[PDB]
Amino acid sequence: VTKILRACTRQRMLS
Amino acid sequence: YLHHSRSCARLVRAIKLLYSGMLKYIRFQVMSLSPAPLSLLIKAAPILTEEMYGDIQPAAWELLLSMDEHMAGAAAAMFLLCAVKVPDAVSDMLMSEFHHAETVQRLNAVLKFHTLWRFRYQVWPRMEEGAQQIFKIPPPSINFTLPSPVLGMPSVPMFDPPWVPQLKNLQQEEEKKRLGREASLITAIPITQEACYEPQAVFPACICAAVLPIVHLMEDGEVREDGVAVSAVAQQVLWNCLIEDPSTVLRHFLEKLTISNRQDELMYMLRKLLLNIGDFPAQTSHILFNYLVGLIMYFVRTPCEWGMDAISATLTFLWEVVGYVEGLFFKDLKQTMKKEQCEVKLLVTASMPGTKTLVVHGQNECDIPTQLPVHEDTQFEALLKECLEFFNIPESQSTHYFLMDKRWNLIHYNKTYVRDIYPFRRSVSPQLNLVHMHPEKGQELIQKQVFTRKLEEVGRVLFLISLTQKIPTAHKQSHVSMLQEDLLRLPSFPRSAIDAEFSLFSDPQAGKELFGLDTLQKSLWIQLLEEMFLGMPSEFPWGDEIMLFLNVFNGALILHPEDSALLRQYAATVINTAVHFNHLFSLSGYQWILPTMLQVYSDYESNPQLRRAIEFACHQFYILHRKPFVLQLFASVAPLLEFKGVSAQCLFDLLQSLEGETTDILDILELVKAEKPLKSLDFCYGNEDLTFSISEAIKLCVTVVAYAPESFRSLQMLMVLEA
Amino acid sequence: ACELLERLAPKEESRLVEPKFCYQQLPVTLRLIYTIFQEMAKFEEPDILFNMLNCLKILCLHGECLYTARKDHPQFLAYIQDHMLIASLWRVVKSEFSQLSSLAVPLLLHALSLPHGADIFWTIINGNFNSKDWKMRFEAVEKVAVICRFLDIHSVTKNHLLKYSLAHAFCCFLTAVEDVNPAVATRAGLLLDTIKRPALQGLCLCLDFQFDTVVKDRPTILSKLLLLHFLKQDIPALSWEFFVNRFETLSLEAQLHLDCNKEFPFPTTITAVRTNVANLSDAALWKIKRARFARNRQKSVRSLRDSVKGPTIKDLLPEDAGIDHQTVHQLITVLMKFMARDESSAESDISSAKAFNTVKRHLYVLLGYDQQEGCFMIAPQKMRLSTCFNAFIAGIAQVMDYNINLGKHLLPLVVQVLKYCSCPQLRHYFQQPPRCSLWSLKPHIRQMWLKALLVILYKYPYRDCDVSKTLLHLIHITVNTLNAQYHSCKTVMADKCHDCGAILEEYDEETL
Ligand SMILES: [Zn+2]
């Protein structure tokens, strides 16, 4: 779940 | 008493036959002789002693069921005055009558309540020409305030009212009027109130509290010897009361929450009333929704001991309430809520700033307070660690000390982000205390409060789901687009919809309850996101942002893979999205979903039910998209292959399950919205290719390599072939 | 060990259900079952419990180990049932690991079919759902939901003990839906949706069986069915065929009472089984046996009614003498509530249309109206005093308002009933200008009469060749009701006008 959250955070940062 | 009334009526007729102005007096101020005592006592209500009220109460109670309207009205006025003056005796009599052992007694109690309800407006005229300056009646003490604009429509106007005064065109107008009349419910409006052309009301708190016994009698199936059941009478009386004026009916119940900790019973009684009546008229639903929202607002603003618990209890039922409110739109909801600074509590898409700082007090009152800057990623654990370092606690009691809020009774779970709980950036920062507690007591309080908060979140999700489902066929796409953009602009959407309390699941006490709530919340989030997806355009131009919405699905399958309900909900919604967003999932999309399903399939090899469900879902995917799905499956299994990680044998097991037809053990197809015999969504692949031979997979990999041998995808497919 | 048992087993599941002792000297399989349960009490890993439940499924099912224990070692089966079997199967049921429950539920049903299983399961359900600890109810909701998820509808339809146990558990779950604790109520409401449609259909069949057999459970069963139909309407819980069968059972009871010269609140001609002669029929004879058993053996298997509530031919009811009237009134009100919220279930298929026509004929009969001769079989006073009419007039306005198609179907019957009820006597029904009035009705029944007439006038075409005359008569009755408030000259002790002898009538503003 932490990996999923970090992927989501990176995705939001890129946008 | 009926004999007495008949005798008095005969005497009145004799006096009339005896006889100018005397006839006017007889017909305007006598009108009968039986109500002369009661109407006298009503005229002397300010000077009546409490003993007189207690003595007159049983007579006025018995006289409520008179055929004579004047007698009934006078008795109702007298009993309402008694309930105003001696509430305890009136309440005891009402409870004794409503819980009486005789069916006739309970039926008569409900009928007498209805007579009181009718003559509620005819007490002041009967009382005195100069009353209501003396004989003060306490006004209904309303504590909270409704939302500044009313959230829903106050009522649905009846189509073509008979009481409102106003050839192809004539025929079509007649047809339109007939359809409108057939579509409009006349039993759900106050027929006589709206049909009267164009005045306080006396209804004290005991008479209002009598509604709860009537709600319970709505289920009292005991039948009188005349064939009349208590349940029918109670339902009719309460339906008429809620039709006429729900505010007076629900005044007592709504005030009781602010008065005392009674929410777990108020919601129970409201749910009981809704279930027994079976519906909610537009005015009733509007009033109840506005009052419940105002109650949530009140407990958000005024610090109360049971405020959070009351908010959770009302969120557990606002979702049922909102399904009947008419004319409620998401944009107006957001506008009113952010006007009232209470959007976070009932809208799961809130987007509040944060606090940016907060002051934490020490255990000692002479200790110098600390101030911690709050950032987006800060959780209460970091704040607690900084406070322990600041206030000189030498790690001997690190689990003894808890961050706590005193104004609002809150003890903060460490893994909760600060800005989630303190979202407003007002001038005054939140003030916390480094409260020393026995670690077990602190953990118990944290478990309880976390459970209440999770139930609140469940209620928020359910409220949004019901709001979306109430929206008409038109305005569906607008509402869905609003939801999607709100989720995208919400900085903490996937985290809020995907996180869990892993530090609280392990506790043998209050750990499994949190897990049950988590499973419910994940299933609700999947359902809400599917509702959003189905309602968006099928050709919606997506991007990498779809992952933001699909990760939640994957998240729900990481926490609860072995839950059959969660597993079949996941499979149903993924199939629904593959069917709906067909073009997206014919080129991509499976790459956002398949790696998670493959990881779960490989991880839980020992679970034959989970493996069967995943294999059935993959079979349905192959049915929808045949070759593109296999290519996406290989592209999403190539990173996971190993020579933890998806093995090279479980992939072959999945393929062998694909080639042979698999039975639906969890009934996944029954939850598929487009539930038909599933066909290839592309006409080109339309064929009897339900069998997916492994040789076909090998040919696919060979073809992907042959297309571009030096591509990265080429080496992915080479790895898949090697496996 | 499970693989070895599979090898030694007949490798074919037999029929799951059929429609102290000495630890040694027992067959080795009974000892193995005993020790598997004993060890399973000591483990919590899902893999361990799954393998152990698989071993039991190979032993208990796939081989008549417990059947042969019942036949040959009754004491051992009694001990196992009372001490380990159902308690441990209930313990191993979890929503997080539904793999365990996939094996637990078939074993649980097999145990229930066996002797001493129903009582233990009854005590478990009653103790859990009636517990004051809200966490225990919270867990029991999950347990029953997961049990329902894996119910084999085919298995339940064979064994009556299974039907009783599942009906009791499902009704307790439905009560937990309407719970005081918000957490338990929300969990129950959310889990009720997670149950698949065939399982819900099987549970509704269990409820129908409970209605048919147990007499004192009928009103609570009807309440639970109405609640479930309200909550999950997609499954058929209330349906036209449901009311057909309920009317069949009630009419069979009525015919039995008529044979025993005792009054019943239901018509004796609705059912198709004539109790005068059986003619060596099969299903009809079984229906007669079930009805007579229900009416005479009221000491049946535990009626769920008390536990459900939250924290030679004739026989008469000793204390609950109004049970029959309650069942009739509740059934008719539930029928009206079904019809009000019916999404045109008829015309979906041939069976539904047949059931709708049957229900329409039965409705004509219930209100005392003979379609063959077009005349009411009863005097207007008997209809007014009738339970069926009182429960029909109280919901007919809502049925006509909410549902238009059924309203169009029911319009002639409704208008005939409305005209007939207001008549003080039979003669008043045959006066061409109706001189009757809404005086013989109860004061709260006049308003429902008027609201039904209002709905008919507001959203129905009443210019038909037949309904128009009766509706004009209804308007005449309304006009006479308005007139009687001011009597102009032109048994219950009442007031008369000494000049003309007519009864003085007064009405309230809500009726005027
Ligand atoms: Zn007269």
B301-315: b (≥16 Cβ within 10 Å) or e: eeebebbbbbbbbbb
CB atoms within 10 A of CB B483: 22
Distances (CA, A) of C127 to B204, C51, C90: 41, 29, 13
Contact indicator for B374, B358 with CB cutoff of 8 Å: yes
Q: For B173-187, what is the HEC assignment?
A: HHHHHHHHHHHCCCC
Cα B459 versus chain centre, distance: 6
B357 phi/psi in degrees, rounded to 5: 180, 160
Q: Which helix (H) or strand (E) holds B403?
A: strand B401-405
Q: In the structure encoding, which two tokens stand for residue C280, read together?
A: 């060596």
Distances (CA, A) of B162 to B158, B171, B192, B371, C459: 10, 20, 12, 68, 12
Q: Which region, left, alpha or beta, applies to residue B9 given φ > 0 means left and ψ of -120 to 50 means alpha?
A: alpha
The CA distance from B477 to B483, in Å, is 10
What's this structure's resolution in Å? 3.2
Q: Which region, left, alpha or beta, applies to residue C96 given φ > 0 means left and ψ of -120 to 50 means alpha?
A: alpha
Rg (CA), chain C: 28
Residues in chain C: 512
The CA distance from B179 to C404, in Å, is 11
- Asked if the C-beta of B2 comes within 8 angstroms of chain C's C-beta atoms, the answer is yes
The CA distance from B650 to B723, in Å, is 10
Q: In the structure encoding, which two tokens stand for residue C322, read together?
A: 């109004």
Of the candidates B56, B23, B61, B62, which has an alpha carbon nearest to the alpha carbon of residue B40? B56
Q: Which distant-in-sequence residues (6+ apart) come within 8 Å of B189 by Cβ? A: B155, B158, B243, B281
Cβ neighbours of B492 in A, within 8 Å: none
Alpha-carbon distance A13 to nearest alpha carbon in chain B (angstroms) = 10
Q: In the structure encoding, which two tokens stand for residue B50, read together?
A: 């409490």
Of the candidates C215, C204, C235, which has an alpha carbon nearest to the alpha carbon of residue C304? C215
Helices C28-40 & C46-60 angle (0-180, nearest 10): 160
Per the CB < 8 Å rule, is C509 touching B519? no
Q: Which distant-in-sequence residues (6+ apart) come within 8 Å of C303 by Cβ? A: C214, C216, C217
Distances (CA, A) of B471 to B286, B481, B531: 15, 13, 12
Contact indicator for C171, C209 with CB cutoff of 8 Å: no
C22 is in an annotated binding site: no
Residues in chain A: 15
Q: In the structure encoding, which two tokens stand for residue B283, read together?
A: 């005015």
Contact indicator for C181, C311 with CB cutoff of 8 Å: no
Of the candidates C222, C221, C453, which has an alpha carbon nearest to the alpha carbon of residue B187? C453
Find the C447 Cα to ligand 1 centroid distance in Å. 25
What is the number of helices (H) and of strands (E) in chain A? 1, 0
Sign of the Cα torsion B554, B558, B564, B565 reads: negative
The CA distance from B453 to C467, in Å, is 59
Task: Considering only the beta carbons, identify the residue of B186, B265, B562 that sits closest to C454.
Answer: B186
Alpha-carbon distance A15 to nearest alpha carbon in chain B (angstroms) = 9
The CA distance from C510 to B418, in Å, is 58
Q: Touching B: which chains, 3+ CB pairs < 8 A? A: A, C
The CA distance from C473 to C481, in Å, is 12
Cβ neighbours of A7 in B, within 8 Å: 547, 551
Q: Which helix (H) or strand (E) holds B371?
A: strand B370-372
B404 phi/psi in degrees, rounded to 5: -140, 150
Residue of chain C whose alpha carbon sits nearest to that of B222: C326
CB atoms within 10 A of CB B442: 18
- Asked if the C-beta of B10 comes within 8 angstroms of chain C's C-beta atoms, the answer is yes
Contact indicator for C149, C173 with CB cutoff of 8 Å: no
Task: Considering only the beta carbons, identify the residue of C182, C451, C506 that sits closest to B316.
Answer: C182
The CA distance from B623 to B578, in Å, is 11
B205 phi/psi in degrees, rounded to 5: -75, -30
What are the strands of the beta sheet with B370-372, ordered from one edge?
B370-372, B358-361, B431-436, B401-405, B410-411
Q: Which distant-in-sequence residues (6+ apart) come within 8 Å of B203 by Cβ? A: B80, B116, B117, B120, B248
Provide the 3-class DSSP secondary structure of residue C232: coil
The CA distance from B333 to B331, in Å, is 5
Contact indicator for B289, B318 with CB cutoff of 8 Å: yes
The CA distance from C149 to C59, in Å, is 23
Sign of the Cα torsion B528, B530, B532, B535 reads: negative
Residue of chain C whose alpha carbon sits nearest to that of B110: C444
Residue of A5, A10, A12, A15 to mutate, interface with B, max B Cβ within 10 Å: A12
Of the candidates C485, C488, C487, C481, which has an alpha carbon nearest to the alpha carbon of residue C437? C481
- Asked if the C-beta of B180 comes within 8 angstroms of chain C's C-beta atoms, the answer is no
Burial class (CB in 10 A: 0-12, 13-18, 19+), C144: buried
Q: For B2-34, what is the HEC assignment?
A: HHHHHHHHHHHHHHHHHCCHHHHHHHHHHCCCC
What letter represents residue C38's amino acid? Q
- Asked if the C-beta of B11 comes within 8 angstroms of chain C's C-beta atoms, the answer is no
Please, what's the largest Cα pairwise distance for chain B?
Answer: 120
C55 is in an annotated binding site: no
Contact indicator for B550, B513 with CB cutoff of 8 Å: no
Find the B10 Cα to ligand 1 centroid distance in Å. 13
B641 phi/psi in degrees, rounded to 5: -65, 145
The CA distance from B135 to B200, in Å, is 14
Q: In the structure encoding, which two tokens stand for residue B303, read together?
A: 């610090």
The CA distance from C175 to C309, in Å, is 7
Q: Which helix (H) or strand (E) holds B610?
A: helix B608-624
Of the candidates B104, B116, B107, which has an alpha carbon nearest to the alpha carbon of residue B234? B107
